[PDB]
Amino acid sequence: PRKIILDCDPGIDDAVAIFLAHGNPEVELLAITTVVGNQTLEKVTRNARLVADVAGIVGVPVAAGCTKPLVRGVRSQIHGETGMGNVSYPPEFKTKLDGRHAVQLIIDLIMSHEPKTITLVPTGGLTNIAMAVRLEPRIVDRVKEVVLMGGGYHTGNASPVAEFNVFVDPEAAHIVFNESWNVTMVGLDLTHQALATPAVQKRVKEVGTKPAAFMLQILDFYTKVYEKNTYATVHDPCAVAYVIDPTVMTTEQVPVDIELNGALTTGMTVADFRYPRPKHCHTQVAVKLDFDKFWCLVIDALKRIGDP
Amino acid sequence: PRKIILDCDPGIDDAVAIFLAHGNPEVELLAITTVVGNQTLEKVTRNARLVADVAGIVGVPVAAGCTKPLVRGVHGETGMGNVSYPPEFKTKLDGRHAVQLIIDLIMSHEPKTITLVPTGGLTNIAMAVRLEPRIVDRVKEVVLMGGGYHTGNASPVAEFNVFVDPEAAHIVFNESWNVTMVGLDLTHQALATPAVQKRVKEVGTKPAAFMLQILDFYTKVYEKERNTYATVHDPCAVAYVIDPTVMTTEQVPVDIELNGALTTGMTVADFRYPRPKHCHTQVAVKLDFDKFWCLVIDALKRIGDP
Amino acid sequence: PRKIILDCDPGIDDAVAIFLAHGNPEVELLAITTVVGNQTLEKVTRNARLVADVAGIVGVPVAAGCTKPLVRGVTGMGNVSYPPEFKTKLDGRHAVQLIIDLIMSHEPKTITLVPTGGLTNIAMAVRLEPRIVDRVKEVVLMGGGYHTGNASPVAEFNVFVDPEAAHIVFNESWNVTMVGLDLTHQALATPAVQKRVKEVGTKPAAFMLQILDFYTKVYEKERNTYATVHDPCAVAYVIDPTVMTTEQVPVDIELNGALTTGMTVADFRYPRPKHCHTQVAVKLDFDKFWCLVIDALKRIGDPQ
Amino acid sequence: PRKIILDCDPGIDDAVAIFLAHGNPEVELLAITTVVGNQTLEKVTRNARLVADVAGIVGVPVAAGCTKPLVRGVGETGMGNVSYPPEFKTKLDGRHAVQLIIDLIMSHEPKTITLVPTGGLTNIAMAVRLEPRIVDRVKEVVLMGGGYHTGNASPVAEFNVFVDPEAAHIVFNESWNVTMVGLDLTHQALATPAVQKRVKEVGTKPAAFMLQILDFYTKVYEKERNTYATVHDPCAVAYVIDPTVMTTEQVPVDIELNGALTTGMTVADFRYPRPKHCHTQVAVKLDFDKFWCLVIDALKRIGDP
Ligand SMILES: [Ca+2]
Ligand SMILES: [Ca+2]
Ligand SMILES: [Ca+2]
Ligand SMILES: [Ca+2]
Ligand SMILES: [Ca+2]
Ligand SMILES: [Cl-]
Ligand SMILES: [Cl-]
């Protein structure tokens, strides 16, 4: 399997990504690390433990990371005051909180495993990844690659041109996108295609298990968020899906940089589609989703998880 | 006919726009005004007089405008694209600065009858707006070639006409008048394919040969910027004035980035929903390719050999 | 006398500048041109005509200029009332065109531009007729502040209200003297100065005292100091350059910064450049400055 | 003694700061941590170990920190014209400077450690974001950097802030108390011929080391000067030793990150009315004779180790 670290801020779609990464046999979750986002670090960390309980994830450290973006002030109409819809939390989690800061855990894991065996899969702001890069620069060449859900070369949500994960910590994104490692940006241009349509939702329900139920409950809290004018798009699992099977989406190799200064455009992932296209480029952007293959991967992972 | 003022920086694109405006029966050129860009004001004013000579354009003042952008600073070519200048131009230069000519024409003509058609940097337009604010409500509308909501050429995200004077663009886009942005998203479709160039060649007149010669010169000069055939840009704005069904448009808020490290000069269009009901700006989307080239070839035919 | 064009946004301190320019014989006022500032162009143009009425200024065109800054967004004078009709007529020309016309029609190097408001008219004139730049003698402006701000921690009002226009002016090749806040915060209207103004005993003196009393109330309330009169300092420099010290240093205008937009950035590092077209005013000769102001009020007297 | 951590990029100024902290009885060095600046992290770390050897500093961990700024890109022998020894006596702690800083602050009682940065603020900012509890636990920060009316790296920016403006913005916008000893203060710490002769008369190896390297860099950087050579970084240590060595003013101070001309400026708001609360203050006027007395005294107390 491909070993991954899932760095996230759950978050309903982060939860679906955790389910996909756990249930699919082609990826091995080495850790779930959390970062401040559009819920406080405390809240998304509680949510990550909740998702890990529901999916019965054992043997995988869950470590809390950065409580604040690098430079920007902290930034919930999407995922709830909870971060996880209207779900009931247990009195007690089975999933313990690792004692390490996520940044130290990411470093420890990368430095102890063989080179080029871990893929980083960030699906929140990039603060933890950037901190780890600056605290231990040797991780950059040791990582296999980075596949992040974030950005948008021609679509914004947080602003006309910026996507939330980059927008909440542009400086951290700038750090991640300007290191020499290979980066795949699974941005809004891709993830707006990952539609949780009624048909897809019925297939989710036909699994008939506690995680499928949890998922559709949080997902129609999400669906009523996205109605108020599309179906819920489930962004973050798209990044995990690419690690499972890169043919699930097309990509294009182009330069991508992060705007830090502009009054209208801070947080933009500026992708250069001009000619000539670079024949060697460490960044690529995702373009077209294979919708059927993607939803097949998500439903297969739910079936595999069963009822822990 | 639609009266227009063509503010430009020829430029092969601007030359084709001038031919289209002059040849097409539905446009009345009131002036050709020139502006600095990546070429100097003096060079493009010489080019504009060459274009006017070749098309036989009489009775239309040609006026030189701003020599520098508002705030920003800033080979082997005989004449324009290896077409020599005559020893002296037949077309004279109007004595007035383009900024003053634009004001004078707008204020002296009845209201809501003149369309401004900028196809270079927006410096003259912005100067005229700040010097005589009454022109804004008096102008029918503005149809400019420039910008790009998901495209760039000067940078990954900015187009030349906006990039060379972002401040002037910010002025033009933030006035209350109706603005149609015919950006690179649209003009990338106006490809001068081999079949199109054969039809141009078959017009068989000196302006057609002039257009093809200069287009070829610039197709070779800028070969490294393309993955397909040469395109023409600026005439698309004139075409929109002639027949607005030549392209589709979407009403959307558009603003100009002025202080981005990577994005200065970007036309930032907000496509998010909900889209505002009343937008004074719209962006051009899809070109009617056959109709566009039919208009261009028709204008050349009608110009004939002056 | 040195011919000047006084470009202003009255404004009590602009009023004092107009009085100084009119009353002192070393300067010849060719025009008073107005520009939008903190008050609208219409309002400061009414104020300029009022000030011209009060001082009996005749033969000097008063021309209204730009209604808006280049790019940025935006019961007579203090408590004096306007007359029902001004004696001073509003010129028909836009200030930008009047500035161009005067410069092009006079011999080269005979006119000094004295801006004491936002620089919008000056910048427009520069871009519309670039020949004025080499033709102007120099520019002496009240604006900016190399180590002092008021509109922000680091920006002065006149530059802050139109940074792009200031950038245009400071980056042309003509000679620029920046009389900024570092200098003008010294031009204090102390009780002794106000008593000497009172004792001139003319209607223009009493006008200046009334509006500067309106000004002292707001400077005590908002800055915890006596009233400073900024704009006449720039006129004073044209009258007599020994009224203040200057230092020749590069100066540029910040346009982008989140904290520093509008700042006049002066480079005091060594080595200094041998050829520098900008200089900044530093130390005011207080007694000489206020002497010049009082002498001009006495010369105007109670005018025709 | 007041416990400090000296986070630095030696650097002859930093060397004098280290000598002053080591020789003066009022301060106790808990650690010397290094950060990239104008010279590479590797180089200034070799320099720090050289300085520690020369001063005979034992029992004080020397730890290498960040090799790059947070966001921005980056006859000499060893240090100036002093060659390194074949092996240093002073060993490198194995911890990253950022982890040593956190460990020291978290293991000591609250409000007993003063951070004294004299290089880019990258390590400090990283430690803040990795372990936010350090911010309330630190007694205060006294940094050499910035310039409210003076620049060297640009017309308005000082090198330490300019090399990592983002890390400065982090350090200046935390709630802890910050004293900025900037160029407006330090341009006064002149090393006049009188001072240099007195330093020479101390007659020790550290004194000759300081004079030799300062002379080297004074010649190399003398067209950028209108007067004698200046020491900068020890002024922050001097403040910790005796706050009356310089005057201060409480004013808001922020860091410009997106200016065309002004990125890296410490923007100090001197306008009235001054705010209710200020957690930052700037140094203004130096007690010249007391500062140089303190430096020469530290050199005498160190002796020849
Ligand atoms: Ca997420
Ligand atoms: Ca053009
Ligand atoms: Ca004024
Ligand atoms: Ca010690
Ligand atoms: Ca240092
Ligand atoms: Cl003269
Ligand atoms: Cl000075």
Short mmCIF file of C-alpha atoms in Angstrom, two decimals, chain A residues 153-154 161 259 265 268-274, chain B residues 147-160 162-163 184 257 262-268:
data_model
loop_
_atom_site.label_atom_id
_atom_site.label_comp_id
_atom_site.label_asym_id
_atom_site.label_seq_id
_atom_site.Cartn_x
_atom_site.Cartn_y
_atom_site.Cartn_z
CA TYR A 153 -6.64 27.83 -10.70
CA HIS A 154 -9.88 29.31 -12.13
CA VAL A 161 -10.21 33.80 -6.73
CA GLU A 259 -0.30 35.35 -4.00
CA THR A 265 -6.19 38.24 -4.79
CA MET A 268 -4.88 32.82 -5.02
CA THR A 269 -3.11 29.78 -6.49
CA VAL A 270 -1.73 31.45 -9.62
CA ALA A 271 -1.32 28.78 -12.27
CA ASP A 272 0.61 29.62 -15.45
CA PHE A 273 -1.12 28.03 -18.45
CA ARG A 274 0.79 30.14 -21.00
CA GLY B 147 -8.18 41.75 -19.71
CA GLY B 148 -8.84 38.06 -19.24
CA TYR B 149 -10.94 36.52 -16.49
CA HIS B 150 -9.23 33.10 -16.67
CA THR B 151 -6.34 33.88 -19.05
CA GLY B 152 -3.20 35.99 -19.23
CA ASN B 153 -0.39 36.84 -21.61
CA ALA B 154 1.63 39.66 -19.98
CA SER B 155 1.70 37.42 -16.85
CA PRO B 156 -0.06 34.15 -15.93
CA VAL B 157 -3.15 36.16 -15.02
CA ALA B 158 -2.89 39.60 -16.65
CA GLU B 159 -3.39 40.80 -20.22
CA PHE B 160 -1.10 43.41 -21.85
CA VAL B 162 -4.48 46.16 -18.48
CA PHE B 163 -0.97 45.19 -17.28
CA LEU B 184 -8.27 36.93 -23.95
CA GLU B 257 -5.68 44.18 -9.03
CA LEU B 262 2.01 38.00 -8.86
CA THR B 263 -1.40 39.30 -9.89
CA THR B 264 -1.01 43.02 -10.60
CA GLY B 265 -3.05 43.85 -13.69
CA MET B 266 -5.42 40.92 -13.26
CA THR B 267 -9.08 41.52 -14.19
CA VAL B 268 -10.67 39.80 -11.20
#
